[PDB]
Structure 1
Amino acid sequence: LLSSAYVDSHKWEAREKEHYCLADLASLMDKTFERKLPVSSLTISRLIDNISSREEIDHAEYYLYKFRHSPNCWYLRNWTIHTWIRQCLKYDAQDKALYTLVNKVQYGIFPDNFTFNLLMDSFIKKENYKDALSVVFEVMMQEAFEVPSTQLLSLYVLFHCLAKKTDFSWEEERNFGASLLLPGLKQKNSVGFSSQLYGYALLGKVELQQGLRAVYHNMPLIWKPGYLDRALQVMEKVAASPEDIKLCREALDVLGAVLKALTSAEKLVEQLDIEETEQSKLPQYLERFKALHSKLQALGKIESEGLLSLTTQLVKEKLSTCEAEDIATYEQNLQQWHLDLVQLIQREQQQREQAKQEYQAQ
């Protein structure tokens, strides 16, 4: 999806590596942890640079865990994370990269948007939609939908997965809904609004079938009830918006199906007893949905184009526009990272000047 110009590694590869035997820094880290002293973020960055093979990737992830569970984990480096991801791509450890990203809690994997898009593009190139879905979910959990490139990538992956997937489990529905609603809100176009409708429909089904806590627990979703109300609000907003904006017929159909299924078919109470429940509001929800769907078809704002097809159109059209700016920002980040590494060396040598005095004081 992304250009080979995007996949370009030349700058990062040309980064001013300090070359060592991986066992060198491995022994250094072992000694530091035996002493129970704090390893240096710079040290772990250099080890990540010195990664040179698959078993070295394994050693590096082990040391990454050990450092993450260390005082200086507060000093992780985005360039170090990017180097890790690039090395995993290099040595075909993409499975390990995905696992570490999922266990970001245990390891601290917090890649930038550029690295997220890199991993997603690699997965799609491999055709690994099943795992591109997981990467999209991790982006959702991290709340990193700040760029149209990532937004479009996630939308395309999710719609492809929906096309190739029929049976759904409520947790999968939750993940899909969140990962669509976020970039859907980000994208102020017909595709974004249709994605918002789809995600709201899924989340409302989850809310009414499992629980609003089940919806908002650990997700980047609000706890205010009325996801179906927000869906109807989105449809009304589209209807009142300029006609060029359209809602996907597939999104409308799935929303109608959700409403129809809900209508057809220890304990704690989270809602104020005076505020009626979605279970009671369901008939009004269905009536409003029918009226709004009829109004939208009358206005012609409905779009019968396939979700995946329209997303592919948008990807082929606007992606490169995003790619150029993304690569420019990536170069800016690369030179910033080089300057930051220079600063790290400055601090390390300045402190070593004093560290020469440990026994001198004695």
Structure 2
Amino acid sequence: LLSSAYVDSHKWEAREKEHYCLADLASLMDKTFERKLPVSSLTISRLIDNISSREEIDHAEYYLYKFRHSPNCWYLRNWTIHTWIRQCLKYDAQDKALYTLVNKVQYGIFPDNFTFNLLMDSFIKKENYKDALSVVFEVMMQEAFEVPSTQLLSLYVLFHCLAKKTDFSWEEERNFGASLLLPGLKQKNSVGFSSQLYGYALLGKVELQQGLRAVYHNMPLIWKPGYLDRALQVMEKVAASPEDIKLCREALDVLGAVLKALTSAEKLVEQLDIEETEQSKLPQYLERFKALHSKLQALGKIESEGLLSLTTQLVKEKLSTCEAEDIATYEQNLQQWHLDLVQLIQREQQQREQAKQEYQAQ
């Protein structure tokens, strides 16, 4: 959905890049690894920047993996990560970019918001929603919903997959629920509040069936019980809100279905016995939901349009504005990254010249 200017790579290819041979840099890194010595962040950056073939991407993957297992792993500069994604997209290696993104622990790939949009858009342009879904999950794991452009792209892909998908596994419900709650809080509109309502319904279902621990374990979610309670609070907030905010009927139906399904139907207790369990509060939740549903319908706070239909209209109105802001900030990063790269090259050059002069004196 991103414009051609946003995904344009002319700016990236116009950087002042020093030409280096991959084999020479690969041989240099091998000698350092055998000596059990740290590898400079400049050396790995040159290796990534000098990728010129599809075959070279596989070789760079190993050294990127080895750099993650080096004492200087934390010094992996951001532009190297962005270049890595740019190289993968350039040589039709989207799977390689996704594989490192899934294995970010083993490779240290932590892209910024701008790069995540580029990777996500490539799957959307090719209608590869299966791979685009994983990218959204990676954003959910890395909590990269601070840019409105990423939030809009995530919502578009997530809602599109929800319509086709019918059977949900407990892991999938946790993933979809978490992946929708994060952008919903940022978006203060009808779609944003619907995502909060829809996301809480999926997470609340996991809490009662699979337990509270499964909700937040290795997830960016709170450990406090009451996901179903927070689902009802969204409806209460919409009930006292301007006419702009509305809740889609699809989200309301899903929450009602979850409550009815739960109503109809390792061993460590993580909650105090004095506190009321969420299972015992199910009849209370059902009574509250029916009252809120009638109140929202009476006030005309229910939107008849589907989630995908309303989200698509939302993208057409705000994506263009968000792209312009991201592009300008991306240009600033390129200027900032270029200055930092020069400093590292100068620092190495001064050290190498200083090392030789001291060696000559000795």
TM-score bracket for this pair, using the shorter chain length = over 0.9
Aligned counterparts of 1:179 and 1:120: Cα–Cα separation in 2: 14
For normalisation by structure 1, the TM-score amounts to 0.98
State the shift of 1:37 in Å. 0.9
The Cα offsets for residues 299-330 of structure 1, whole Å up to 9 and x where unpaired, read as: 10011101000110011111011011111111
Name the SS of the counterpart of 2:111 in structure 1: coil
Aligned counterparts of 1:200 and 1:351: Cα–Cα separation in 2: 56
State the shift of 1:361 in Å. 7.0
Aligned counterparts of 2:53 and 2:274: Cα–Cα separation in 1: 63
Residue equivalent to 1:17: 17
Aligned counterparts of 2:102 and 2:14: Cα–Cα separation in 1: 29
**8 Å Cα contact 2:21-2:50 kept in structure 1:** yes
Q: Tell me the matched-pair count.
A: 362
State the shift of 1:349 in Å. 1.6
Aligned counterparts of 2:218 and 2:266: Cα–Cα separation in 1: 21
State the shift of 1:35 in Å. 1.1
Residue equivalent to 1:161: 161
Aligned counterparts of 1:358 and 1:94: Cα–Cα separation in 2: 47
The Cα offsets for residues 226-278 of structure 1, whole Å up to 9 and x where unpaired, read as: 00111101110011111220001000000000000000014110000100111
The Cα offsets for residues 145-201 of structure 1, whole Å up to 9 and x where unpaired, read as: 011100000000000010111111010111111110000011111100000100000
More displaced, 175-184 or 340-349? Answer: 340-349
When residues 124 and 266 of structure 1 are mapped into structure 2, their CA distance, relative to the original with a 3 A threshold, is closer
Aligned counterparts of 1:266 and 1:200: Cα–Cα separation in 2: 25
The Cα offsets for residues 131-156 of structure 1, whole Å up to 9 and x where unpaired, read as: 10000000000010011100000000
Aligned counterparts of 1:177 and 1:344: Cα–Cα separation in 2: 43
Name the SS of the counterpart of 1:218 in structure 2: coil
State the shift of 1:52 in Å. 1.0
When residues 264 and 357 of structure 1 are mapped into structure 2, their CA distance, relative to the original with a 3 A threshold, is farther
State the shift of 1:359 in Å. 4.3
When residues 361 and 266 of structure 1 are mapped into structure 2, their CA distance, relative to the original with a 3 A threshold, is farther
State the shift of 1:355 in Å. 2.6
Please, which runs of 5 or more residues in structure 2 have no aligned partner?
A: none
The Cα offsets for residues 51-85 of structure 1, whole Å up to 9 and x where unpaired, read as: 11111001111100101111111111111111000
When residues 224 and 266 of structure 1 are mapped into structure 2, their CA distance, relative to the original with a 3 A threshold, is closer
When residues 361 and 163 of structure 1 are mapped into structure 2, their CA distance, relative to the original with a 3 A threshold, is farther
Please, which runs of 5 or more residues in structure 1 have no aligned partner?
A: none
Residue equivalent to 2:212: 212
Aligned counterparts of 1:155 and 1:280: Cα–Cα separation in 2: 33
Name the SS of the counterpart of 1:360 in structure 2: helix
**8 Å Cα contact 2:141-2:219 kept in structure 1:** yes
**8 Å Cα contact 2:149-2:319 kept in structure 1:** yes
The Cα offsets for residues 97-132 of structure 1, whole Å up to 9 and x where unpaired, read as: 001001011100000100000001111001110110
When residues 230 and 88 of structure 1 are mapped into structure 2, their CA distance, relative to the original with a 3 A threshold, is same
Name the SS of the counterpart of 1:256 in structure 2: helix
State the shift of 1:353 in Å. 2.9
> 1:1-362 counterparts in 2 under 5 A?
1-356=1-356, 359-360=359-360
Aligned counterparts of 2:136 and 2:278: Cα–Cα separation in 1: 30
Aligned counterparts of 2:75 and 2:184: Cα–Cα separation in 1: 33
State the shift of 1:357 in Å. 5.5
Aligned counterparts of 1:361 and 1:301: Cα–Cα separation in 2: 82
Name the SS of the counterpart of 1:114 in structure 2: helix
Aligned counterparts of 2:335 and 2:9: Cα–Cα separation in 1: 14
**8 Å Cα contact 2:189-2:244 kept in structure 1:** no
The Cα offsets for residues 20-72 of structure 1, whole Å up to 9 and x where unpaired, read as: 22111010111111111111111000000111111100111110010111111
When residues 271 and 358 of structure 1 are mapped into structure 2, their CA distance, relative to the original with a 3 A threshold, is farther
Moved over 3 A (4+): 357-362
State the shift of 1:350 in Å. 2.3
State the shift of 1:351 in Å. 2.1
When residues 74 and 361 of structure 1 are mapped into structure 2, their CA distance, relative to the original with a 3 A threshold, is farther
- Identical-residue share of aligned pairs (%): 100
Aligned counterparts of 1:215 and 1:107: Cα–Cα separation in 2: 26
Aligned counterparts of 2:358 and 2:68: Cα–Cα separation in 1: 27
Aligned counterparts of 2:249 and 2:358: Cα–Cα separation in 1: 73
Higher relative contact order (CA 8 A, sep 6+): 1
Aligned counterparts of 1:313 and 1:212: Cα–Cα separation in 2: 36
Aligned counterparts of 1:355 and 1:178: Cα–Cα separation in 2: 53
When residues 361 and 254 of structure 1 are mapped into structure 2, their CA distance, relative to the original with a 3 A threshold, is farther
Name the SS of the counterpart of 2:350 in structure 1: helix
